[PDB]
Design a protein around this ligand. Structure first.
Ligand code: ZN
Ligand code: ZN
Ligand code: ZN
Lengths: 41, 65, 46, 263
């Protein structure tokens, strides 16, 4: 209902569109299938 | 990143054997040791060249543009 | 056919002047790469 | 029929096992070094890049191209660019090849050294020709292209020698040995109980007579007879490395004789 700030997101947690992405989808996403990603951008 | 062309230590051309090699393995179901010897790779310098190679160019290709 | 930029998604030989912010045709990707060079480079085979 | 004499054990398109007798360790050794580093050969030494959408960088590709073996039997008549009077290169001091490859199919397009296209006048001499000893005939894998990646190049190959760069190496790897039994005593074997049982034996032993239990050390014997085997990358015939190698070393010593003359 009401907006308040933005929450950076750990790179591969529930939100990050990569927590679902398969291998073939990662490649198109220009992200490496080997990245562990537990970091923030 | 691609099969080295030529083995570091002596220079036996080892760039024309990647594919041959990967084939003597798959279909001919040979052990790496026998495959190598048949590709004529007798000295270990030459052997470690192919055996140890990781063909990354394969995942490098998988990115669209 | 001459260009100056390129998108990292459709690779359309774009290129535009000032007051065009950053964008492609249908590819609103605000990235753009600077094509290549025409004078071609020479390399030491060593 | 004079000093250095040869006995060949095996021969082929790539290997030549032979026995050199009536020769000092020196000559046997130099002759070896020469082969490894002082025999002229043709190799791509210049690469101009038109298009590279490959996943490899330009200098990466270029380094491999310079590495691809090329015919070199008639090099003895091709000239050293640095000695040719042209401005840069020409059909008198080079061989120009071209490599054009485009990822057509969607099955990954492989680029081989057989896609190299000589565009300069070879003037009827056998030289410059990607060498190929493959079963399917694809002399060395240069690169791999995906969906629609390009690669336009022009390569200029020049007469060279290993010393300048290992690529001008036509000798692959030389087998050297002498005194298979340690008769001469040029080595002190490291043992753990029994040297003779711990260190394997060379097939050269078979070609020489054992030492005999109680014979005193032959302090006057020197190094005679060397059991070698010259491999060959192809650029030049096996038998050729040996010859030209002997030639080169021969011409070298010659130059010192000329030098003392001019002096
Ligand atoms: Zn080797
Ligand atoms: Zn676009
Ligand atoms: Zn010239």
């Amino acid at each position: 209902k009401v907006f308040i700030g933005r929450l950076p997101i750990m790179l591969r947690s529930k939100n990050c569109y990569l927590s679902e992405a398969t291998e073939s989808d990662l490649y198109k996403l220009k992200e490496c299938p080997f990245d562990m990603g537990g970091y923030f951008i | 990143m691609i099969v080295p062309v030529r083995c570091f230590s002596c220079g036996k051309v080892v760039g024309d054997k990647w594919e041959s090699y990967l084939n003597l393995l798959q279909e001919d179901e040979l052990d790496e040791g026998t495959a190598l010897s048949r590709l004529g790779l007798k000295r270990y310098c030459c052997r470690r060249m192919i055996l140890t190679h990781v063909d990354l160019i394969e995942k490098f290709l998988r990115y669209n543009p | 056919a001459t260009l100056k930029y390129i998108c990292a998604e459709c690779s359309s030989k774009l290129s535009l002047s000032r007051t065009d912010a950053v964008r492609c045709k249908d590819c609103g990707h605000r990235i753009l790469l600077k094509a290549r060079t025409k004078r071609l480079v020479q390399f030491e085979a060593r | 029929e004079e000093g250095p004499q040869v006995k060949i054990r095996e021969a082929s398109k790539d290997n030549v096992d032979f026995i050199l007798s009536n020769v000092d360790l020196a000559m046997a050794n130099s002759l070896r070094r020469v082969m490894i580093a002082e025999i002229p050969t043709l190799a791509i030494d210049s690469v101009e890049v038109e298009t590279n959408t490959t996943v490899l960088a330009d200098e990466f590709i270029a380094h491999r191209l310079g590495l691809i073996p090329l015919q070199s039997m008639d090099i003895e008549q091709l000239e050293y660019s640095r000695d040719c009077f042209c401005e840069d290169h020409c059909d008198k001091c080079s061989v120009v090849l071209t490599l054009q490859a485009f990822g057509e199919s969607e099955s990954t397009t492989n680029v081989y050294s057989k896609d190299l296209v000589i565009v300069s006048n070879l003037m009827g001499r056998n030289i410059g020709h990607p060498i190929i000893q493959d079963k399917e005939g694809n002399g060395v894998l240069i690169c791999k292209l995906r969906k629609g990646q390009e690669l336009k190049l022009t390569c200029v190959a020049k007469k060279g020698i290993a010393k300048e760069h290992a690529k001008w190496g036509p000798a692959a790897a030389i087998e050297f040995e002498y005194d298979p039994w340690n008769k001469l005593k040029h080595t002190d074997y490291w043992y753990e109980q029994d040297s003779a049982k711990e260190w394997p034996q060379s097939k050269n032993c078979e070609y020489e007579d054992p030492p005999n239990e109680g014979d005193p050390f032959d302090y006057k014997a020197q190094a005679d007879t060397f059991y070698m085997n010259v491999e060959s990358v192809g650029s030049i015939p096996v038998d050729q490395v040996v010859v030209r190698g002997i030639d080169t070393l021969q011409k070298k010593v010659a130059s010192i004789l000329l030098a003392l003359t001019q002096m």
